[PDB]
Amino acid sequence: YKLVCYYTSWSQYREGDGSCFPDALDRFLCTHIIYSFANISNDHIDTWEWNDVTLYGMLNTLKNRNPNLKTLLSVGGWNFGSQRFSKIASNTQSRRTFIKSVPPFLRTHGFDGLDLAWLYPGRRDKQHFTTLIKEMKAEFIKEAQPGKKQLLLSAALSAGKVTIDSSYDIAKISQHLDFISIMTYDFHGAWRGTTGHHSPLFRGQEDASPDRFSNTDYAVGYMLRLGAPASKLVMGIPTFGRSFTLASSETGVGAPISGPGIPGRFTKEAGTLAYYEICDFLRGATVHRILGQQVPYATKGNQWVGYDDQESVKSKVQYLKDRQLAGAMVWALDLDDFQGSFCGQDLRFPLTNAIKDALAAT
């Protein structure tokens, strides 16, 4: 069972204990650690943060004492701009240049592979995206043909049905990718105007669901159906929750909201709270287990946050194993209690460790 974990380079700037650097990550926690994100300049894979190289080595040093730990560099991201990614992949020269620039850059900085995080292709890129993945793998195979350990190629894919239908040719790309991370969270935007868990396992009360597709179970199964081999499918689990600001005395699923929740003390972004920020939130709050969805939400005052915890991630791992999937993907290591100071127990990476334990269990 693969345990793909994401590290975001921008988590370094978070205030106080919030600040997170690769060297603060547990080398034995995950089987794969992905660095996010690498940029693309002049159609060449390139660093993004001024100190990426330094952090690259900081991350890759973890491989010294643990040879099995695999490492990947993720290119794309949210601030990339699907616009650019489209052109690059669309243009035949740009695509070639970029693909050819990857293997060198990776070996040069100590990475075991590349992770495509094009977020997200459009209806017009469905094929370009296929071509890209196909040719990128070709190159990796070539580059190692002489006898090296072949570079890994993975991709983070949307779990939203609309996007999967318009942008992905699951069957085709599943052949070339070594593994796919299905981003099964962010199912409920604060725009929907009602409270809702952003990462439910199942649909739950058929009566109160907005969508019939906005849940983990559906996405996993849909993808399996579309041709993605279970052995190549990694199910994403979030270590963060989506928040909302309540508009009335109603605090249950589907209650009225006036917008996203108050920003977290360390992540500073409305509608988001890192699990460790949640641990603080829980103090004096009330947790409700959402029957049917297998996930919890907590509410206190005029704040509402849907998230995952030991119990829910355990169920989710249970689910994926029962589905015979490649493993779990975590987003992100810097959002889990990596200090181990917030959720008490002094235990580090409570959610991630919980996931790791469940995977080895039984």
Ligand X SMILES: CC(=O)N[C@@H]1[C@@H](O)[C@H](O[C@@H]2O[C@H](CO)[C@@H](O)[C@H](O)[C@H]2NC(C)=O)[C@@H](CO)O[C@@H]1O
Ligand Y SMILES: *[C@@H]1O[C@H](CO)[C@@H](O[C@@H]2O[C@H](CO)[C@@H](O)[C@H](O)[C@H]2NC(C)=O)[C@H](O)[C@H]1NC(C)=O
Closest approach of ligand Y to the CB of residue 341, in Å: 31
Q: Name the residue number minimizing CB distance to ligand Y.
A: 41
Residues 294-353 that bind ligand Y (CB under 6 A): none
Out of ligand Y, ligand X, none, what residue 84 binds, judged by CB under 5 to 8 A for its kind, is ligand Y
Binding flag, residue 286, ligand Y (CB under 6 A): no
| Rg, Å, the chain Cα set | 20
Distance (Å, whole) CA 289 – CA 196: 13
208 phi/psi in degrees, rounded to 5: -105, 20
Q: Does 13 bind ligand X (CB under 6 A)?
A: yes
Q: How far is the CB of 60 from ligand Y (least distance, A)?
A: 20
**49 has binding-site annotation:** yes
213 binds, among ligand X, ligand Y, none (CB under 5 to 8 A by kind): none
Does 51 interact with ligand Y (rule: CB under 6 A)?
no
Residue type (1 letter), 145: Q
Q: What are phi and psi of 302, to 5 degrees?
A: -95, 25
**In one letter, which amino acid is 334?**
D
91 annotated binding-site participant: no
- Contacting residue, 48, 85, 179, 276, with ligand Y by CB under 6 A: 48
Site string for ligand Y, 71-90 (x = CB under 6 A): -------------x------
- Residue 172 binding: pick among ligand Y, ligand X, none (C-beta 5-8 Å cut-off by kind): none
Distance, in Å, from the CA atom of 17 to the CA atom of 15, rounded to the nearest integer, reads: 6
For residue 216, the Cα-to-chain-centroid distance in whole angstroms is 13
Contacts of 324 (CB under 8 A, 6+ apart): 230, 231
Sign of the four-CA dihedral 287, 292, 294, 297: negative
| 41 touches ligand Y (CB under 6 A) | yes
The dihedrals phi and psi of 184, each to the nearest 5 degrees, come to -80, 70
Of residues 79 through 138, those in contact with ligand Y by CB under 6 A are 84
User: What single DSSP character describes residue 265?
Assistant: T
Least spacing, CB of residue 79 vs ligand Y, in Å: 8
Q: Is 183 annotated as a binding residue?
A: yes
**Cα-Cα-Cα-Cα dihedral sign, residues 163, 167, 171, 174:** negative
- The Cα–Cα gap between 15 and 265 comes to 9
Contact positions with ligand X (CB under 6 A) in 43-82: 49-50
Is 218 labelled a binding residue? no
Backbone dihedral angles phi then psi of residue 126, each to the nearest 5 degrees: -40, -45
**Least Cβ distance, residue 80 to ligand X (angstroms):** 12
Q: Is 79 annotated as a binding residue?
A: yes
Q: Is 125 annotated as a binding residue?
A: no
| Residue ranges in contact with ligand X by CB under 6 A | 10, 13, 49-50
Binding site for ligand Y (CB under 6 A): 39-41, 48, 84
